[PDB]
Write a protein that binds this ligand. Structure first.
Ligand SMILES: OC[C@H]1O[C@@](CO)(O[C@H]2O[C@H](CO)[C@@H](O)[C@H](O)[C@H]2O)[C@@H](O)[C@@H]1O
Ligand code: CA
Length: 559
């Protein structure tokens, strides 16, 4: 029995404001650039937008190092602009989700400026300060962004903890005053009518008592160990009870590092924690858990097994999001498809069909609706991202990995592949900016741009538009149960979605050759709901499909 909600049936679109549309020529996108393109997202059929952080920030980590939670980022505009965004989405019946980054603040935040003053400052224990051991760090914790997770302060002689950049010191959630202050901050944004909150690295708020050294095995998988704090569900439930349950919102939790079997405690509706799971098992299936910048070969059978495990883990009482890329990962068509010119549009339409036929809330990352690709990074200085510089420092500058081997991996895995500016049209800089963009635009913008697709009925954009309309029209594509026809098949991905008598089949050929695919058991086709790249017609009661390379489709099955 499905408990339907607006957020289970929504299709979300993720805007990275820095790279969406610049309206004043400084080369950085801004809030007015979002406002000006709301009609575009409305034509796509999006009903909710999640924006990456929009707060005052020195931008060590592009908005994720927040200097003031109640001020708009200078580069993105003013509080008036923010209020106008809310008001214009409201006019269009679109709901806004903002990014909540409360594992850490900027080292420029008024709290940390006070805290670092001296052991006797009232704000001292808003952050984690510990003594060194034999004139080195308190323990062997590594940072996600390179080097040690402990930064020595000369004023006090103590180290402060930063799982991410040295400019992002971790907040001390063990102090109830910190949690209260964070709660007032949330009410500030919620009182403005925001409809959703995405919690950045939500599983790391609880730190391990006494900070023991990690073991050898643990250092190779430290992201999991940092999710092992003994109070994380107590804090998330407390936030639900004191804030989240008092408003009418959807909450998504980014549970990076949490083993899949432990994810349901954050999202089971009975636990009064969060609503929508962002899991990383799928999107990192081809990533090394230790040398986190490296990729490795993967197969469709691996990919489909993860889909099914993730689906089953949500079960009856949790709920998943589903996404294939985002601002932290390479573009879907390059990562999971074939981004060469012969195949790109077909593979993009095949991955859109996958996304929009999952038992999950789909998130569409900006530009994926056009089939944008990875960017051709050459040299190490072609990248912007703090994280890639941290990996370079840890692995290349130490002589552990050859520069060229590192680059062969990070060209494929870098976050910056998702962050090149949105390709609006075929004008100079793809119409993103009248100035010099902050990060160079992919030269494939003359082939891949929204102007060339919005009115072409055959485009990637219109195929997403069609799929979103189909999903809204067929309840089984949102709430139906999921069954993979053959989890070991590395050629043809085929699964059903079922609600009572109503059963649909999704079939995608991941091979660049014609595949014949015979349906199992007594299954036979009642109707074609949609196909891309097909050549052989499908008639009533067909029990076989002849799939062109990269062909994708949705069929309704006979009862
Ligand atoms: O590669 C990014 C790294 O950080 C995670 C959290 O583990 O991503 C979130 O947290 C970071 C620090 O606030 C942000 O830089 C990132 O953009 C945000 O999504 C994971 O995605 C990943 O391990
Ligand atoms: Ca701008």
């Amino acid at each position: 029995n499905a408990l339907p909600t607006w957020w289970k049936q929504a299709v979300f679109y993720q805007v990275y404001p820095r790279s969406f549309k610049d309206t004043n020529g400084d080369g950085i996108g801004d809030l007015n650039g979002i406002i000006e393109n709301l009609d575009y997202l409305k034509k796509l059929g999006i009903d909710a937008i999640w924006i990456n952080p929009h707060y005052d920030s020195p931008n060590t980590d592009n908005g994720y190092d927040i200097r003031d939670y109640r001020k708009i980022m200078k580069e993105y505009g003013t509080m008036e602009d923010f209020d106008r965004l809310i008001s214009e989405m409201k006019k269009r019946n679109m709901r806004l989700m903002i990014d909540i980054v409360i594992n850490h603040t900027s080292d420029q935040h008024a709290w940390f400026v006070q805290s670092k003053s001296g052991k006797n400052n009232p704000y001292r224990d808003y952050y984690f300060w510990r003594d060194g051991k034999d004139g080195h760090a308190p323990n062997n914790y590594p940072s996600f962004f390179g080097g040690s997770a402990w930064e020595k302060d000369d004023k006090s002689g103590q180290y402060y903890l930063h799982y991410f950049a040295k400019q992002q010191p971790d907040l001390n959630w063990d102090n109830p005053k910190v949690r209260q202050d964070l709660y007032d901050m949330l009410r500030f944004w919620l009182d403005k009518g925001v409809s959703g909150l995405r919690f950045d690295t939500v599983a790391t708020y609880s730190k391990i008592p006494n900070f023991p050294d990690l073991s050898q095995q643990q250092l190779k998988n430290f992201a999991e160990e940092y999710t092992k704090g003994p109070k994380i569900h107590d804090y998330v439930n407390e936030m639900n009870r004191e804030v989240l349950s008092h408003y009418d919102i959807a909450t998504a939790g980014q549970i990076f590092g949490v083993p899949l079997d432990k994810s349901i405690k954050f999202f089971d509706r009975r636990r009064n924690e969060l609503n929508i799971a962002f899991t990383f098992d799928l999107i990192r299936l081809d990533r090394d858990a230790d040398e986190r910048w490296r990729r490795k070969d993967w197969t469709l059978s691996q990919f489909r097994k993860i889909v099914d495990k993730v689906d089953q883990t949500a079960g009856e009482y949790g709920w998943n999001a589903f996404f294939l890329d985002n601002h932290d990962n390479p573009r879907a068509v390059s990562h999971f498809g074939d981004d060469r010119p012969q195949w790109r549009e077909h593979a993009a339409k095949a991955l859109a069909t996958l996304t929009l036929t999952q038992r999950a809330t789909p998130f569409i990352y900006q530009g994926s609706e056009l089939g944008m690709t990875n960017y051709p990074f050459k040299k190490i200085d072609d990248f912007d991202d703090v994280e890639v510089k941290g990996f370079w420092q840890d692995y290349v500058e130490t002589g552990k990995v050859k520069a060229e081997e590192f680059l062969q991996n990070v060209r494929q895995t870098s976050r910056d592949n998702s962050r090149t500016p949105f390709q609006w049209d075929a004008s100079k800089n793809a119409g993103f900016t009248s100035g010099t963009p902050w990060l160079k635009i992919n030269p494939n913008y003359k082939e891949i741009n929204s102007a060339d697709q919005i009115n072409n009925p055959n485009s990637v954009f219109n195929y997403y538009r069609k799929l979103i309309n189909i999903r809204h029209d067929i309840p089984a594509l949102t709430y139906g149960s999921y069954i993979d026809l053959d989890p070991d098949n590395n050629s043809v991905y085929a699964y059903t979605r079922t609600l009572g008598a109503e059963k649909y089949l999704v079939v995608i050929n991941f091979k660049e050759e014609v595949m014949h695919y015979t349906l199992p058991g007594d299954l036979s086709i009642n109707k074609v709901i949609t196909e891309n790249n097909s050549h052989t017609i499908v008639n009533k009661n067909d029990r076989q499909l002849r799939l062109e390379p990269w062909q994708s489709g949705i069929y309704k099955l006979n009862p």
